[PDB]
Paper text:
Nucleoporins rich in phenylalanine/glycine (FG) residues form the permeability barrier within the nuclear pore complex and are implicated in several pathological cellular processes, including oncogenic fusion condensates. The self-association of FG-repeat proteins and interactions between FG-repeats play a critical role in these activities by forming hydrogel-like structures. The human nucleoporin Nup98 plays an important role in multiple physiological and pathological processes. The N-terminal 384 residues of human Nup98 (named Nup98FG) comprise two prion-like domains connected by an approximately 50-residue-long linker.
To understand the mechanistic basis of the impact of the F319S mutation on the self-association and aggregation of Nup98FG, we aggregated a 30-residue peptide, which comprises residues 298-327 of Nup98FG, into amyloid fibrils. We subsequently optimized the helical parameters and obtained a map at 2.67 Å resolution. Each layer of the amyloid fibril of Nup98FG(298-327) is formed by five peptides in extended ß-structure-like conformation. Four of the molecules are oriented parallel and one, located at the edge, antiparallel. Side-chains are tightly packed without the presence of internal cavities. One is generated by the 300FSFG303 motif, which forms a four-phenylalanine patch (purple). The second one comprises the 317GLFG320 motif, which contains the mutated F319, and is flanked by two additional hydrophobic residues (methionine and valine). Together they form two zipper-like hydrophobic arrangements in the structure of the Nup98FG(298-327) fibrils (orange). In contrast, the tight zipper-like arrangement of the FG-repeats in the Nup98FG(298-327) fibrils facilitates hydrophobic patch formation with higher stability per residue. This may make it more difficult for nuclear transport receptors to open the FG-repeat meshwork in order to transport cargo across the NPC permeability barrier.
Numbering used by the authors:
A (entry chain K), B (entry chain P), C (entry chain U), D (entry chain F), E (entry chain A): 317 to 326
F (entry chain V), G (entry chain Q), H (entry chain L), I (entry chain G), L (entry chain B): 299 to 323
J (entry chain R), K (entry chain W), M (entry chain M), N (entry chain H), O (entry chain C), P (entry chain X), ...: 299 to 324
U (entry chain Y), V (entry chain T), W (entry chain O), X (entry chain J), Y (entry chain E): 300 to 309
Write the structure that this text describes.
Amino acid sequence: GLFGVTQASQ
Amino acid sequence: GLFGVTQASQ
Amino acid sequence: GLFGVTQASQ
Amino acid sequence: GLFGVTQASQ
Amino acid sequence: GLFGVTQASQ
Amino acid sequence: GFSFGNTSTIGQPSTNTMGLFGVTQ
Amino acid sequence: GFSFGNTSTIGQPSTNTMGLFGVTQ
Amino acid sequence: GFSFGNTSTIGQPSTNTMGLFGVTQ
Amino acid sequence: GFSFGNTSTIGQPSTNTMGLFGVTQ
Amino acid sequence: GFSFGNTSTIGQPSTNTMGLFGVTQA
Amino acid sequence: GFSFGNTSTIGQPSTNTMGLFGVTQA
Amino acid sequence: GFSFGNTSTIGQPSTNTMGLFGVTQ
Amino acid sequence: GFSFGNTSTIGQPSTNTMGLFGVTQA
Amino acid sequence: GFSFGNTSTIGQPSTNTMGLFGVTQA
Amino acid sequence: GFSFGNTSTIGQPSTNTMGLFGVTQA
Amino acid sequence: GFSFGNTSTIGQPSTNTMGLFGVTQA
Amino acid sequence: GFSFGNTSTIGQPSTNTMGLFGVTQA
Amino acid sequence: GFSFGNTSTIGQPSTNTMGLFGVTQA
Amino acid sequence: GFSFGNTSTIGQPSTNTMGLFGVTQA
Amino acid sequence: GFSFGNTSTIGQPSTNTMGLFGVTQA
Amino acid sequence: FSFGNTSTIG
Amino acid sequence: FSFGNTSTIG
Amino acid sequence: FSFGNTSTIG
Amino acid sequence: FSFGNTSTIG
Amino acid sequence: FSFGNTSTIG
């Protein structure tokens, strides 16, 4: 169960 | 179950 | 089950 | 169960 | 159970 | 003479990889 | 003469890898 | 003469790796 | 002559690794 | 007069090898 | 007078090999 | 002549590692 | 007069090898 | 006159090897 | 006249090897 | 001889083998 | 001889093997 | 001889093996 | 001889092995 | 001889082994 | 200059 | 200059 | 200059 | 200059 | 110059 994971790279 | 995962790269 | 995954690259 | 994890790298 | 973990690197 | 301009070798890949694996009985 | 400009070798990959593995009975 | 400009070798990868592993009975 | 500019070798990786491991009976 | 100039090499492999195998549901 | 100039090489392979194999449902 | 500029070798990795391990009966 | 110039090499492999295997559900 | 110039090498491997294997649910 | 110049090497491996294995649920 | 020039080589041979060797499924 | 030039080589051979060797499934 | 030049080499051979060797599943 | 030049080498061989060797699952 | 130059080497071989050796699960 | 993995799988 | 992993898997 | 892991897995 | 792990797993 | 772990696991 996954709810709202965020993976961001800049 | 996955709900709203986000993978962003810049 | 996948609901709203986002894969973005810039 | 995962709810709102955030992985950000700059 | 995970709720609001934050992983940030700059 | 025999000069060159401002050279640039830019390699910028933008890949989106997604593997979906499922075995159900 | 025989000069060069401001050279640049830029390699900027932007990869998005996602593996989904599931076995259910 | 025979000079060069301001050279730059920039390698900037931006990877997003995510592995999902599940076994359920 | 035979001079060079301000050189720069910049390696800046930005990786996001996430492993999800689950066994349920 | 010898200027060896600039030699810039960048190796960035993206090997994404995924595999699900060896699942015996008896 | 020798300027070796600029030599720029970039290798960025994108190998995405996926495989599901060896599933025996008896 | 035969001079160089202000050189810089900068290696700045930004990694985010997360391992999730779960066994439930 | 010998200037060896600038030689810049960057190796950044991205090996993402994932595998689920050897699951026996008897 | 010998200037060995600048030689800059950067190795930054990103090996992300994940594996779930050897799960026997009898 | 010998200047050995500047030689800069940076090794920063990112080995993230994860594994769940050997779970026997009898 | 007189071999003047920069040598900047990238060797990345890729060999991806996902196989079934000596497998007796059912 | 007279081999003048910078040698900047990147060797990254990739060998990814996900296999089944001598497996008796059911 | 006269081998003039900088040697800046990156060796990163990758060998990823996720296999089943002598496995009797059920 | 006359081997003039900086030697700046990065050796990072990667060997990742996640396997099943002699396993009798059920 | 005449081997002039700086030697700046980084050796970081990586060997990651997560395995099952002689395992009798159920 | 030789490029190629001598591989014998099997 | 030799590039390639001598690999014998199996 | 030799590049490659001599690997015998199995 | 030799690069590669002599590995015998198994 | 030799790079590589002589490893025999198993």
